[PDB]
Amino acid sequence: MDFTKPETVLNLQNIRDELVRMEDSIIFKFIERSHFATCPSVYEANHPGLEIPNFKGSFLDWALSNLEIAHSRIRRFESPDETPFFPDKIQKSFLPSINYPQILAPYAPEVNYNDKIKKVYIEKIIPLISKRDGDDKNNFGSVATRDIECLQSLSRRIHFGKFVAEAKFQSDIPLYTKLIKSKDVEGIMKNITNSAVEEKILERLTKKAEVYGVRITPEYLVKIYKEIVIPITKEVEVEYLLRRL
Amino acid sequence: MDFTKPETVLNLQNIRDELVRMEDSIIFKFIERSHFATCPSVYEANHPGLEIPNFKGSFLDWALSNLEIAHSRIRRFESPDETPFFPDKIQKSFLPSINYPQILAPYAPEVNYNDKIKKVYIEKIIPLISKRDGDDKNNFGSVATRDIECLQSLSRRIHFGKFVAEAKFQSDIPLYTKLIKSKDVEGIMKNITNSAVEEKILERLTKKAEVYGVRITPEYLVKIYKEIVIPITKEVEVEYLLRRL
Lengths: 245, 245
Ligand SMILES: N[C@@H](Cc1ccc(O)cc1)C(=O)O
Ligand SMILES: N[C@@H](Cc1ccc(O)cc1)C(=O)O
Known about the structure:
homodimer, mainly alpha, binds tyrosine, aromatic amino acid biosynthesis (chains A, B)
């Protein structure tokens, strides 16, 4: 797959493979973060305790923004692959700009979920995967980096659902146009996902978790994933598809 | 293991576990980088082609330094765990300084291998693990990040050999003092490593590689590791130990 070649992106088996790569990650990112306590202070807004000059926003926010700025000068946020959490602060690169051919529909950028992702990460995911609850002041830096990477993995995967949904639409125009025209959510819902194949994916994902690393059993993790992360993946697909005509 | 508790660091089973975590990584970092071409320009000194203002040094150097500066403000380079590649440019943190009790001998900082690590990475490792040779200009940023992470994993592991060797020395003072006093390298050599246990580690490591991802077979990779990386690990142990009295 290459984002400079539409045909290679819209290819179903290719995306199929890409996801396997971007879904295994989120799982590896979670297993990493699961070695630290909850560290509420790392998220409490306005960074209570850290003397950050006029910064307003959690410690996590400062760190993530700070690291997104550093990562941008090397073209990280120019690929249709990446969507930053702080667009208003990412710098430009001293490397040549790459011509990425249009693949998705124009409105595509309007379909952004970043703020939702971080909200479920911090409120719903963290409490479940932490080693324990409480601030671990000697690891605020380690923990913060972990979140930034778990946020980065959740985003890229979730937002890749526009390509996943665009490839699908185009794989069967006649079918989707009808579903879309009748604003039939559930119709769309059942055609972009096969229970038979989704489960085998999760069965594979569980096996990876165990062999990788790991209080949190492999199967329990895959369910945290299946029940809090998956639903958001599909919200991007149906939103995109509905306004596709 | 906690670097604020000497007893928990010097603990043999703990380090045993830590390595398993820091050795599996290097392997995951290699499998990642193995999806890109060699990109010689990314290493060619003085960055031929990239208009970097008075910078002198490869593109990799600019990137790595740039990202080490960003990672430092969150205490990354204060833990006895991390040793930067560009000490003369890492900033300070706006977070409280952590009191890390002395564990290793005073001369410890003199035993630095960073420049060797990057030299074997770029000249010996890259040519073997790349998908192919040649510049892949549309990925110089992706590739560069991969190296930074493979450099970061190689370092932390290799330099952790001072703790690994200090724990050993202290685990059997009488034994090591004799070996050291006679400047008996091979003696030291055979006592810090058991062929029986080293192989089981590699056997385990191979299994991980396969299940993780993967031209480069799992077993072939583990050998690249065993033959170019391991030797440097032991060079840190014997150097440290020799000047331990
Ligand atoms: N664990 C230390 C040092 C550290 C910080 C950030 C890192 O990415 C790595 C290590 C801290 O949290 O202060
Ligand atoms: N692959 C693109 C964008 C990119 C850069 C750096 C990254 O960390 C990620 C993506 C590039 O190399 O320019």
